[model samples]
Target: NAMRQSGSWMTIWDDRILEIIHEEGNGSPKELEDRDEIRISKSSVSRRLKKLADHDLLQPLANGVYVITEEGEAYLNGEYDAGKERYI
Candidate 1:
């Protein structure tokens, strides 16, 4: 649960499972499942990867390989860490 909070309503969480993919530099859905216990469905993982890439947090290095962006690195380093949390 690597998450961070800014002012009220500003929060996000680290994509730990996604980070593992970056760590390995390349892997398929089954490879990820083999390494982590994350229960996200295959379609869900695909969608997540797309979203991350859309945000420029992750980039496809090749057909099935991906590289984490500088922003992602910052996020993982506890710099841009945030949570999907809101304060009242």
Candidate 2:
């Protein structure tokens, strides 16, 4: 149940961050901060990126870059919902 609980525990900002990464294929917090859609602060972007990486939903490539994990891809494909209690 812990796994299930954790899987579904994602915030609005988290999903947005994931969506941005998924769209770009890979990006750093500074890159995300430069995006026109989200318009978030660099510090906030860094914090969220760290949180996503901590959740195992992101894979760090090099420098400060990160790519979405398989699970994160699934979330973008609608096979999984990080905001839901179960897979869709």
Candidate 3:
């Protein structure tokens, strides 16, 4: 439940999870699962990761790796919406 207000109607964990990935520089869903801060679930994080990256917030790299996008930074910057996909 490492989720809070996302400033938009997205999965609550979307904001918190994106922050963890952003702060970690680059990461995979499994890479964050065992972490204490988000402690959601490996599989669950994967789903969130897909959804987040789907918005270009996070960029998926080779072999399950992921990195932040400009949008990802703005997400941390609180200048973007995580639910941008819902409308478009």
Candidate 4:
């Protein structure tokens, strides 16, 4: 519950996407589309990445790739786990 109230809250799949990025270091929108077992259009990944960037949770790199931000990495590392989802 608390996690949802955070300004940079993430959807479940958002965390999945971040994990992919952290593991792969980088991946194109198409790669993510292929990974999620969904035939998502490019725009879908593009839109989500934009939202992540807006929250400073992801950063766009050259050649249509994105990487997780330092804060994002730390959050996933269990270093700053808090908010609504923690209790769930």
Highest lDDT among the candidates is held by which one?
2
Counting clashing residue pairs in each candidate, in order, gives: 4, 0, 0, 5
lDDT of 4 at 51: 70
lDDT of 3 by residue, 37-64 (tens): 7757888888888877777888989888
**Where in model 1 is the C-alpha error above 4 Å?**
1-14, 81-88
Model 1 steric clash pairs: 4-82, 11-83, 12-82, 12-83
State, as a TM-score between 0 and 1, how close model 4 is to the true structure.
0.68
Each candidate's lDDT (Cα)? 0.54, 0.72, 0.71, 0.66
Top candidate by TM-score = 3
- The 10-residue segment of model 3 with minimum total lDDT is 1-10
Error of model 4, residue 30, in angstroms = 1.1
Winner on lDDT (1 vs 4): 4
In terms of TM-score, how similar is model 2 to the real structure?
A: 0.72
**What lDDT is reached at residue 6 by model 1?**
32
Instruction: Pick the winner on TM-score between candidates 3 and 4.
Output: 3
Clashes of 2: 0
Of the two candidates 2 and 3, the one with more favorable TM-score, higher being better, is 3
Tens digits of per-residue lDDT for model 4 on 1-88? 1232333455666676777888888756878888854345677777777776766667888887898877567656764342432312
lDDT of 2 by residue, 1-88 (tens): 1222235456567777888888779878888888877667888888878877776678877788899998766666666556552466
